[PDB]
Design a protein around this ligand. Structure first.
Ligand SMILES: N=C(N)N1CCCCC1
Ligand SMILES: [Ca+2]
Length: 223
């Protein structure tokens, strides 16, 4: 996250870190046994880390649970990033409390102008590299589809939305991928792609979760 603030320990209780020896992507806990992330974060050998603040120090609220299966969306396209969404089942259920909690799925799609919270452990610089260790947060609005399509001609599908600031300076960045965009207490987006980080006229692009609720619910019910 570029241009954000330190969230505070366990203030984003649905945020997870995906670990394969190191943090590589975020995700969101949607019930006691399932996480949603980005398809472009897929790899074998995932440990899900819940209850994290500092990802390099054991602070006492963590739960570390390995994945039993991963399900990439059936129509994910790695060239265009259309349908950039993946479900991860935990080998055992997490123990839910005030510091480790699920986030609700939306029952309607959020409108442009809605303010949302984006979080992650990704790079904090638009030029160069500095990875922060504690969780960072950013408040940002959803942008109109017309603004989004004008920023990225020929690239925005109905399964994507833009959020952030056209003036630049505040955005998600590398290592935030897969993490949550929460608006009015519901998971509306997944950190997906963008050109660089925090550049003028290049806002972040997010997977539009409200289009996937039926697939999520059906998949969980059957796996
Ligand atoms: N929001 C931006 N700029 N991103 C998404 C996360 C990876 C880098 C590009
Ligand atoms: Ca920790």
């Amino acid at each position: 996250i570029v241009g954000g603030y330190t969230c505070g320990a366990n203030t984003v209780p649905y945020q997870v870190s995906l670990n394969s020896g190191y943090h590589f992507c975020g995700g969101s806990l949607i019930n006691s046994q399932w996480v949603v992330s980005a398809a472009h974060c897929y790899k074998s050998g995932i440990q899900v880390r819940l209850g994290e603040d500092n990802i390099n120090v054991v602070e006492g609220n963590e739960q570390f649970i390995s994945a039993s299966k991963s399900i990439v969306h059936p129509s994910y396209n790695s060239n265009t990033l259309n349908n950039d969404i993946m479900l991860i089942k935990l080998k055992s259920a997490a123990s839910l409390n005030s510091r480790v909690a699920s986030i609700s799925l939306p029952t309607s799609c959020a409108s442009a102008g809605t303010q949302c919270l984006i979080s992650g452990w990704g790079n904090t610089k638009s030029s160069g590299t500095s990875y922060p260790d504690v969780l960072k947060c950013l408040k940002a609005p959803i942008l109109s589809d017309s603004s989004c399509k004008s920023a990225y001609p020929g690239q925005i599908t109905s399964n994507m939305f833009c959020a952030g600031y056209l003036e630049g300076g505040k955005d998600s960045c590398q290592g935030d991928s897969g993490g949550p965009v929460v608006c009015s207490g519901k998971l509306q987006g997944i950190v997906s792609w963008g050109s660089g980080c925090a550049q003028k006229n290049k806002p972040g692009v997010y997977t539009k979760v409200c289009n996937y609720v039926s697939w999520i619910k059906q998949t969980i019910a059957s796996n």
